Structure formats: C-alpha cells, structure tokens
Subunit: 148 residues, 3 copies
C-alpha cells in the first residue's frame, strides 16, 4: 500500500481525515439548526418550510457558519502542509505530536465555538493548533529553498 510511502504518512492521513469528517459534522449541525430554528438563507428553502418570513438570519446559524469558516481557514492549509511535511523525513514521534496537537486543538476549537465557552478558550485553541502548522510551514520552506 502507498500509505507506506513515509513513516509519518499514516498518522497524517488519520488526523486529516478525522478533521474532514469533523467539518462534515459541522455542516450537518448547521443544517439541523436551520431546520429547527426555521432560519433559511434562500427564499425557495423558506417557502418549502413554512413561508417567506423564515428566510432570515439566526445567531446560532451564523455561529455555525463562523465555526465552519474558521475550519476552512485552518484545516485546509493543514491538509496541504501536513501532507508535504510527511514526506520530509521528520522524526516519527515529532510528526505525530504535530498532527495530534492540531487534531486536539481543532476539535477543542469547534467544541468551544459551538458550545459558546467563555473567552479566551476558543482563541487559545486556535493559537495552539496554529503552532504545529507554523512549524511545518517553516520546515517546508527550508527544504524547498535548499533544493532550488
């Protein structure tokens, strides 16, 4: 199997795929909030589900959208950085720690966001998860630059 291409790759693929699934969960939650609170973004949706007055914004829907957007701002770069980083021959344990800190930090971020936890819990989880990303980005820069 081509998952064996590098020692850190299986760990990366596990964490990344779990995070993609976590984003899918956020999308499902968003839909449920829209349906249960009757807050739709489109008139065609609202008309099917009770009338035009239900094409409206809702604070909980907006919160779900913010969590999903923050995921797109952070998890998508990780998908790129972590994949490339897996092929740079990092220490296996060190690589696992990068991926695990990101995974735990991002899951905690979504819990803090959707659960409306007190500040600065969410902000802290964002920063903690960004640390391994910054680390990987720098390592990739050095490897790329030295092969120019």
């Amino acid at each position: 199997s081509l998952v064996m291409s590098s020692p850190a790759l299986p760990a990366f693929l596990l964490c990344s795929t779990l995070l993609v699934i976590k984003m899918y969960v956020v999308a499902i939650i968003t839909g449920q909030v829209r349906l249960r609170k009757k807050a739709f973004a489109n008139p065609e949706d609202a008309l099917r589900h009770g009338g035009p007055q239900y094409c409206r914004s809702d604070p909980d829907v907006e919160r779900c959208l913010r969590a999903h957007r923050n995921d797109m701002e952070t998890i998508y770069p990780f998908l790129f950085l972590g994949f490339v980083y897996s092929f740079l021959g990092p220490n296996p344990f060190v690589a696992w720690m990068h991926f695990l800190v990101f995974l735990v930090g991002r899951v905690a971020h979504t819990v803090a966001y959707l659960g409306k936890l007190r500040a600065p819990i969410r902000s802290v989880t964002y920063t903690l998860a960004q640390l391994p990303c910054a680390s990987m980005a720098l390592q990739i820069l050095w490897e790329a630059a030295r092969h120019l």
Copy 2:
C-alpha cells in the same frame, strides 16, 4: 507520465480539475452580477463604477457568494480525499463512480443554486455529492489506521 501512478488517478484529476474550473466560472459569474447590478463590496470599487451608493448588498450577489462558499465547503475536501483515495488501489469502476457522482452532483448543485430551482432540489444534490466523499473518507480512515 506520473498520471499513471495509479489506475484511478486520471479519472480523479479530470473530475477535480473540471470542478476547480467550475468554481472559477462561479467567480466570473459573481463579478458579472456585481457589475451589471452595480452592487460592490468596496467603496473604491463603487466610486469607479458610478458612486458611493453602489457599495451595497444585492440578493443575487449574496446567492453567488453562497454557491461559491458551499463549493469551498465540499469541493476542497474532495480534492484531498479523492487524491488520497486514488492511491489506495480501489476498483477502477467503483472509483470512477465515486468521482462521477461527485462531479454530476456538484454541477447540479450550482445549477440548482444559481438557477433558483425549487426546494429540495439543491439540498438533494448536496447530499448525493456528499455520499462518495463520506465513502472515501471512511476507506482512507481504515487504510490509515491499519498502517499505524
């Protein structure tokens, strides 16, 4: 050519690249709607195109932005999942069906969204396209986990 690395890869690259181009088309449409309806997001844009009153929201522009955002929420994960999945030695026909269902579902989604088709047509296309993504995600999880 390195497109021959795995039997499913060419099909994946065809569908993915078509979907990226489809997102570029949505961006172009959005710009055209802004210009034709004179609804700009920035005062500097509005001042060049008729005056400050044209820095304003428009329902059609907002709809275009929602379609593009939904694309980012779904197509970007597919770019990751489908690429990895291509290297897990899936049955070629089964892989093609995953990619084709996603491609058709997503093109239909954009048509349903921008064309303002009645509910739940758009919602159905979203769910149909998510099915192969969920399938690939699970398969990657198993492959990654078993190589830990």
Copy 3:
C-alpha cells in the same frame, strides 16, 4: 529528499508555503483589527473585552474577512493545481513563471485590498494571478484526459 521528485516541485513548494504563511498573516491582522477597533463576532469575546456593545461589525474587519475569503477562493485551488502540474514535466522556467506570477499577483492583491488602493488595482491583480491557474488547469485536463 522527496522534494526532488520533479524539477519544478521545489519552486512550487516555496511559493505555496509562502502564500499559506501570507494567509496566516491576514488572519493575524484580522485579529489585531478586531482587538484594536473592539469589533467582535461573538458575545463571549465582547464581554471579555469591554461589554456587549462590542459585539458588532466593523468595515475594516469586514474588509480583512473579504481578503481572507478571496485568498481561500484562489490560493487553495493553486495548492492543488500547482502540485499536480509540478509532476507533469513542464519546462522548469515556464513552471517557475507560472508560480511566480501567482505569488506576486496574490501578494499584490492582499496589499491592494487591505491598503484600500484605488480601483481597478485589486481587480487587475486578481485577474493576473488567475492566468497561471487557468493555464495549469487546462494542462492538467489534457494530461488527465489522454490517460483515460
């Protein structure tokens, strides 16, 4: 090192990683604008930083969010397209020019957006950066199609 897999790859990884870092910079700027202008998206954030009246929108924050969103609409597809393109054996110089035009165009875009430069400077930088992306997308299409 696996950065040597193709002659264009190191250049791609350098430009892509710089652009990811540039997006991280936009996120940091956004946070600074929120804190300094006291414009938070969440009541929990506002309550920690002065009171509920600071859960409010701000034009500079919204501008930062637009720049970041435009980055997600353009840089993320480049991460995919440029990676695949690196493995299609393009002329090394031609590949470098694709990556450099994208890098310069996107950095200029962020400067034009956040710096509130007169129209159509930002629009021009967007279009200039999209050119190499369109070029790579077409080249990938041909390579993928011919291997079907």
